[PDB]
Design a protein around this motif. Structure first.
Motif: not given
Length: 103
Positions: A89-103
């Motif tokens: 999921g998004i947890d995996g995406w974060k662990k891979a160092g890819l960008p997320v948008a946080v409020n």
């Protein structure tokens, strides 16, 4: 089939849809910028809208559980596309160092 965050990125660069099946409150708190929101419950009621259809569709949720446990529902909802589930999921995406948008 599961897909790594980096392999998902390459498919998204070629037009693949990335669909977040979480709720809006979860999405608004933190999401993948490339993703389109479509909560699972809405998909189960009214299906995948035409604007979210593509040759390749990648679903994700928080940590891989909701996608894994609803694999058969998701396979039908996106048929007849080539369908993937984002690994962890998004947890995996974060662990891979890819960008997320946080409020």
């Amino acid at each position: 089939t599961t897909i790594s965050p980096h392999d998902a990125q390459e498919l998204i660069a070629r037009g693949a849809k990335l669909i977040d099946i979480r709720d809006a409150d979860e999405y608004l708190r933190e999401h993948i910028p490339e993703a389109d929101l479509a909560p699972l419950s809405v998909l189960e009621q009214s299906g995948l809208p035409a604007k979210l259809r593509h040759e390749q569709i990648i679903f994700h949720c928080q940590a891989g559980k909701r996608t894994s446990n609803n694999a058969d529902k998701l396979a039908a909802i996106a048929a007849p596309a080539e369908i993937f589930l984002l690994e962890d999921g998004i947890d995996g995406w974060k662990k891979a160092g890819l960008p997320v948008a946080v409020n």
